[PDB]
Design a protein around this nucleic acid. Sequence first.
RNA 1: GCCCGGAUGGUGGAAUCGGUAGACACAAGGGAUCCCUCGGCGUCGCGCUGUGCGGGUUCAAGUCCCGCUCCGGGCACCA
Length: 860
Amino acid sequence: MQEQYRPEEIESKVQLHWDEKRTFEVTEDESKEKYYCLSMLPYPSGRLHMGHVRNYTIGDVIARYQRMLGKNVLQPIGWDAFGLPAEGAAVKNNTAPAPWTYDNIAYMKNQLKMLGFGYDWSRELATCTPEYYRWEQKFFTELYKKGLVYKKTSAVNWCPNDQTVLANEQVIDGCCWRCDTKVERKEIPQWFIKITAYADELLNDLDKLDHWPDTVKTMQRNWIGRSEGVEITFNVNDYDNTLTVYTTRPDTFMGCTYLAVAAGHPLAQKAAENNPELAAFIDECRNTKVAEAEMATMEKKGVDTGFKAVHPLTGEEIPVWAANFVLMEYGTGAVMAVPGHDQRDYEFASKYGLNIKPVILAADGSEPDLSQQALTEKGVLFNSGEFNGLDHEAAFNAIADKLTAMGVGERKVNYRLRDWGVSRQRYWGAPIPMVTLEDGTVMPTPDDQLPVILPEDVVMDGITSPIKADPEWAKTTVNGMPALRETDTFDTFMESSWYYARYTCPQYKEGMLDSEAANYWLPVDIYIGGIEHAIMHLLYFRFFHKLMRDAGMVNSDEPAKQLLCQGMVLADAFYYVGENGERNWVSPVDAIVERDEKGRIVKAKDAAGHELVYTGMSKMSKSKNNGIDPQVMVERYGADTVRLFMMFASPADMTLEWQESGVEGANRFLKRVWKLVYEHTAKGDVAALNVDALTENQKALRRDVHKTIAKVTDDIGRRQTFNTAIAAIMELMNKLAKAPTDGEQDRALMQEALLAVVRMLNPFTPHICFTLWQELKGEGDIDNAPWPVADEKAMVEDSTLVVVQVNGKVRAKITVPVDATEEQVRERAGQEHLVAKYLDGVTVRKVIYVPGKLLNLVVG
RNA sequence: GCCCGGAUGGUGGAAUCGGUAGACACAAGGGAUCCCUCGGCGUCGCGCUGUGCGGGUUCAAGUCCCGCUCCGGGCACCA
Ligand SMILES: CC(C)[C@@H](O)[C@H](O)C(=O)NP(=O)(O)OC[C@@H]1C[C@H](O)[C@H](n2cnc3c(N)ncnc32)O1
Ligand SMILES: [Mg+2]
Ligand SMILES: [Mg+2]
Ligand SMILES: [Mg+2]
Ligand SMILES: [Mg+2]
Ligand SMILES: [Mg+2]
Ligand SMILES: [Zn+2]
């Protein structure tokens, strides 16, 4: 053993050993309890960043821990390889997306290997390969045939010049990120999967997920947004079509004083034929961008349509207004307004002079003051004809029943959750296996024509997808007739929704899943990812799991028993605007920055002299060029130091503002462990430890080793606070460095301790541990060593520390036999001069005794 | 705007079930790879104060409640 710890002479040697022994390659071994430890697969943007490093270290820590408990652990890795970033990057770099992606995969695979994550490389998948996506295509066709897929018109950001569909990220201030002109909404026919058919199940099964955090379960409930209400239909006077609204507040219905209607509503359109203010307004609205955040912050605006709906119950004509905040796609395109009791409606009505009609009494039974704002509280009705005096429940029911009897209303369940738009009009994605025949009929691509392969050998131009530009490509024949294949491609969450199941049988050719292998490994025991994916991805993932259950592909109702959503790793993000409009994102490594007394960035320049817009600390990201690559730290300090640092900096669930400073802590600590092992083992073999004949000083030390094993075990296995586990190991290491090591018992004890420390560290820093384990003459390779177990007999204590407070303020700390009464603790407490000092002249009014821990004498 | 989080020393963080605030480290300063000091203010072998800010509940709040400021995640085409 070398005196000096040299990660360059260790890490690659140990990685080579795992590659060659196939250490982490697993099969469906029925002799072992499985454990499936899954980390959210990487998108191959080119480099890892520290967000990746935290995700996969947490996951590797757990997979190694579970292996040491004797489990057969599948920890798989793969690439979520389709998507937008490959398209811009290929244009700019004069490549195609495929070759760019596969190069990023190779680079990034090498970085993963160099961090030493124990992945089963034999199960490596890339989602952009037809061996993968053929299965989701077949599955889609089966989903369409079972009536779970439909086509409708949906809004897309449209650049009228380039004639491109843009993602929201590419829309910058309602103008493009290429040339400059106003992006507009274009309604476009697209495919949707009826995730709403599973809304209730998705909502309800949250109650089974006892090992998913409440943050994620609440965000998902609120996203699905299930509601119980009433749909109501209105006639409109010089108009041949009815108008339907949904409300969850039918009780306030007599207070409905106007309807609002989406700029694109046929009623608005008709009215626009005879009204120039209106026409101009509808046309302003085509440049309302599709993004809920923008819908909800924009100044709310309306023009009167001149049409009047008839309130079904009161009979009065109420105005129909066209509004910039109501969308045709997200319901019936019409909403009803109750400005007396909805603050948003109140604001609109105040702005426009519409009737604000009160129908709920104030808390005292008087008519409410609506001069400043709405009375939003549920209450007793008045000014509501036959419904006066009813409360919320009863008014809901009475008004619902009446409208139903009249044939203009029905009780309806509503969800905020919309169906899943899975169409994209980009090239770099899996082709949607649908076809239009010469006939005009549309159908799934026939089975013998699956997969529909995306050609990878392409010339890109940024504007048009090659499969859309090549005329021949879409041509096929179906039912003996000419047909055109769909040139849209799948939303990439399609591939990431089922990868976890495909990792169980990635080389299986006869079907999407080998259910035998799927049912050995599933469900995922723990799914490690960022909080970023708490909603969209996790919901889609749960849904897809239920879809496959309903195809009889899987046993479980849910895909993942436990979920560990780490906080995001953040880094400062910067950009300057390029001379033709476009944001150029500069790495924080390259920004020159001046800082506040509070640490806040206050000026920011790139080295080229550009003035950088500082956007804040935000998730390390492919898109914002703010991802910090670990390569240089791994090369300087070693993978083990980087991994320990990441696990040490913060507990997984906190969000982390990345900084390199602090690494010296991990690195120096690893050098101390190395030194201690070196010094111990330079001395040779140890005698068997004689427990019954230990000193008190030796007993004490042995207690702390075992107390450290128990705590570390709890911290990793129950709390997932890795940072505190590592701190416990450091504390123990600090005691062990001051332990004498002359005698045989002292050395026997140090052997036991070090064998314990090196195993407890192995998940975090496995290359050094693998090596040290050998120096200690541990049995076998550490990857297979049992996790140390604490012995209860070694950690008994007859004494306990009691803090003594007077009036909540610590005045003494005393040691107290564990059998001590309160009365004896009092007396012992009285013996301390700093307790007597605050008791002289006063009366103890109340004693609080937390047995074995605290005495608060409340005095005066 | 809406949903979910968050704020503890110069810095990352610890306090797990309401019970010693600042473990463990980094950085910096001092002393000889190691030891020391290290929130702030002032009988220091003492005392007061202090967990973003404003209030509550409680013998007791970093923890629970209400509110405010600032900050992150998501908001359906970033993945
Ligand atoms: C499962 C699927 C939808 C995702 O995995 C998607 O392919 C993706 O996001 N890939 P990624 O950005 O490479 O990052 C891979 C994972 C996702 C997870 O949130 C984590 N991650 C990504 N970025 C961060 C980050 N900044 N902080 C903390 N964690 C981060 O690594
Ligand atoms: Mg902090
Ligand atoms: Mg602070
Ligand atoms: Mg306390
Ligand atoms: Mg102090
Ligand atoms: Mg405070
Ligand atoms: Zn443009």
